[model samples]
Target: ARQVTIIGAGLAGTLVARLLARNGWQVNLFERRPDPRIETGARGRSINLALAERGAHALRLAGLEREVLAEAVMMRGRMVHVPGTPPNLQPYGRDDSEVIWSINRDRLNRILLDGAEAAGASIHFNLGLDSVDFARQRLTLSNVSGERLEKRFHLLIGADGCNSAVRQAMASVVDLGEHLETQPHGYKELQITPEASAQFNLEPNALHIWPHGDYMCIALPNLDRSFTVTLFLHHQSPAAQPASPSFAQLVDGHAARRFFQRQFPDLSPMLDSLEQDFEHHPTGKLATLRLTTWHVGGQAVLLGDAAHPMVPFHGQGMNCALEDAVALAEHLQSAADNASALAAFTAQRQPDALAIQAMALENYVEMSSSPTYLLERELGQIMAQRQPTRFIPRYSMVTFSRLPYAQAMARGQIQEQLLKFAVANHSDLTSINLDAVEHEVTRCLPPL
Candidate 1:
């Protein structure tokens, strides 16, 4: 029997291990960090994740989607918080069935790890892969005690994150064409503690957004009574200055405070701890990592963030990672040789991965800085409600539809261009019959 060694026991690595192990492959999964089950304090490190259709599909394939969904909080759309106006609901898609979910990252990882173990995969915690020798089919790793050791395996998979040591090692022997693009923006997590009555202060079912031009803040609900709020801003902005001693000092002194106070009043009291979180919590840098080749010879391959890491704006990172695992597993199970399997997996997935990466990068502009054009929004609403067959929003295509990234992006671009043309003509979107405009844009799209 062939043995498969997977690095990084996050969602991708664990799921890969479970899939392979159940199919009779001897799977050994390794994580650099200590086991979260035992290290209770490490629970809240990463913010909760938004599990959308793609993520749900992957989890369903792994037989864990239903269980995970049971613990998730459904987020139908963005609850836009604008000053001097009531919070507005901006659903991602036209129908109610289209939704993105909020699930705790720690909880999700725990379940996946347990599933892998239950599937008879051996998961090694506190073990990090230091290097790989593809020709020799060997790996150098640091054990729990930090002692260096060499191990041999039939196959290697790198699900390690953006800073993948396995990827670096593999690149030493092969041209992976890897590049990491770190954005000027960074993020910090803040807590919106539950009210005294054990009720949510804001809409619990929706993802709340306070978009201040050039910066923004968002809150995603947790299974617990609290909401995990993440503040994203330029790293060099005055609000991000570490020397600012108080939340008031940072918020008031910076221009983003007025918008924060007016749009997110309920989140104000919680700001007393905001400065501390700002000062102490690690500033997460957003980046887009791309690798032209995901595999080396027949012995090793990279998946998830290891292969292509995109910014989190589009909420597709984890979903893409899980999809990668399933594709890789299926390829390995069907192909005659590991080398061929790796090549096939890359061929099938690389384009989709790159397309999602581009969309994710573009979404940062929409989320953080892009001014919401009233004409565009109105047109989108009208088209969604009245012309369901012809018009669909880009966010809807990316989130709710199973359309491939390239197709989704192409369709979205066409719609956006149509909207731009309408706006340029000073056309009143509400009054102008969509049936008249439909002809102009329909030719740009393929038959759905």
Candidate 2:
């Protein structure tokens, strides 16, 4: 049997290990951190993540969709939080019943790890790979007991995160052009504790977005009867003022208070422990990591965040990474030569990854700074309710469509182009006919 050594015991690595092991490949998974199931240190980070249809579909293929959904909290739509008026509803799809889910990341990772072990894969926790000998297919690793050992495998897969050590080692042997770009924005999480009455302050079944034009704060519901709120803002510069303030400063200064009063009035009371949460939690930087090539011969291949680390604006990073593992496994199963399989995997996924990266980067502006014009937002709701199947929102297309991310983006762009032209030609929607614009957009969509 062929042996596959996967570095990193995170979501990607665990999923790959499970799939390959189930398919008769001997899989060895190694992680730098101690076993999370036995350790508590991995807890307390931004534990929750939005899981849309794309992610659900990927998990379904792995036969774990039902298990994941059992523990998830469904979020039907976005609850837009305006200054004074009551929050408006923006359903993700035409039917309010169609919903995405918010899942605990740590819980999902634990599930994947356990699933891998159950599938007969060997999981070595607290064993960090030091370097790789590409010529001999040997991996040098250090175990928890501070013992160093070397193992040989038919293939080495790098499932490490954004700052991937495996990718770094592979670069020494291959000319893999890697680029990492950090966005000027930084994000910090705040807690919206449940009310004393044991009720949620905001709608628990919806994602809440408080767009402040220059910055934005979003809250996703958690299974623990709390909401994880993340605020994305500009980082401090010498000349320009910082958009994010320290926890103490926010509580004491007038800016944050004014923002709370004006933007999220009803949310203020739930933020009693916001200062503590902000002060204690780390501020995460928004960044993108890109690599020109994901493989060096058949000795080593990069997957997931190691190959493409995109910002989380579109909530597609993890889904895309899962898709990468599935695609890699499929290629390996079909191709006669391992090198050919790796090459095919890269050729098939690179374009889609790049396209999704671009779309995800653009979504940050839409979610954070872009103004949602009154007419556009209203028209979107109306069209969604009235036209249903024919006119779906851009967000819906990007999130709900099972189509490839690149294809979904292309269709959305075409729709946007047609909408712009129609709006320019006919300012008044009541007097204008959208038949021509709809036909134009239909031409760009994929064949059913």
Candidate 3:
């Protein structure tokens, strides 16, 4: 019987496990922690993920999206919180077809694990890779006990994380150059419980963003009708200090309270647990992990955060990881050998991974500092309506389409410049020449 080993058991690992199992390959998945379903294994770092079409497509492949979607809450657009005024809800797409989803990370992980297990994949919890003797086709995985489990594998998929043991193993065995880009910013999770009626206090259909000039806080809806709020901020101040208004400032309860009241007055009243969450939760460090290569021999491959860890600004980290699973599965399905399949996965995925990483980095500024002027919104809406194929917003491109992230970013940059020009001199959409705008769009952007 043919068998493969998957390390990490994260989104990418379980997803690929399901894919391989359905394709008649025996799957053995190892995780360093206990089963998420049993213990939830959810530490304080609950990063909200916005699931887009790329991820939906992968779930569709696993034939498990129906239930998964049921568990997820629909997020129609960005609800940009305005101080002392009603928020401006910037729609992501023309209609319902273009919405993204907000799901609890634990729920989604459990679903993926369930899918993999239902497809005949074996999951071993509390077991982590100790050593990978790839030359001898043996993997040493052990638990906290002194005991050890030796496994022989035809293939090994490293879906661990940014700090991946499999990646280190591969680095020692092969010439895979690894680079880590630590972001200046970090995040801490907070929550907004449902109202007494168990209904959402804020609009449940939109992603809420309190966009500060240099830092931002975003909230995504959950099935329990609560919201998970995350604050993304710099670690220190600038000039006088490289990162200003840093997490250090908020570590003080009085300071954190004052910060919320002063910066997000509209949301301040709703956060009863503001100081509690701020003081209790750990601030998670952000980074973008890059590698010169994703795989060594046919026997080894790195996937997801392990392969290309990205900041969550664009909310495509999980979606991109899920897409990787599908891509690897497709390559494996048609390739002549494991090495060829791994090569194809790397060749096809590396560009897209880097593309999303770059976009996610840029998105930090967009979410935090960009002036969300009404004219810009109008122009984007008009452009998307008039020339839907050519003038889709970058966010829409990444969330709504199945296009490769690299292609989307390339087109999005061009569109960004065009939109800037369109709104630059004009104060309103009425003054701008819609015909000229469409002409410019058609000339520069080919139909997707």
Candidate number with greatest lDDT:
3
Highest-scoring model, TM-score: 3
Whichever of 1 and 2 has more lDDT, that candidate is 1
Any idea what lDDT model 1 has?
Answer: 0.80
Residue pairs in clash, model 1: none
Pairs of residues clashing in candidate 3: 236-243, 236-244, 237-241, 237-242, 237-243, 237-244
Which residue runs does candidate 2 get wrong by more than 4 Å?
A: 39-46, 143-147, 196-200, 238-266, 369-392
Sorted by lDDT (best first), the order is 3, 1, 2
Candidate 2 lDDT at 420 equals 62
lDDT per residue (tens digit) for residues 188-225 in model 3: 78778777214424888889899887888898887766
Residue 48, model 2, lDDT: 79
Per-residue CA lDDT of model 1 for 240-346, tens digit only, reads 56543223335432334443565456555555455456656776888998888888878889999989889888989998898888999999998999999999999
2 against 3, candidate with superior TM-score: 3
Sorted on TM-score, best first, the list reads 3, 2, 1
Candidate 3: Cα lDDT at 437: 85
Stretches of candidate 1 off by over 4 Å are 39-46, 196-200, 237-266, 369-372, 385-390, 430-433
Cα lDDT for residue 295, candidate 3: 93
Candidate 2 has an lDDT of 0.77
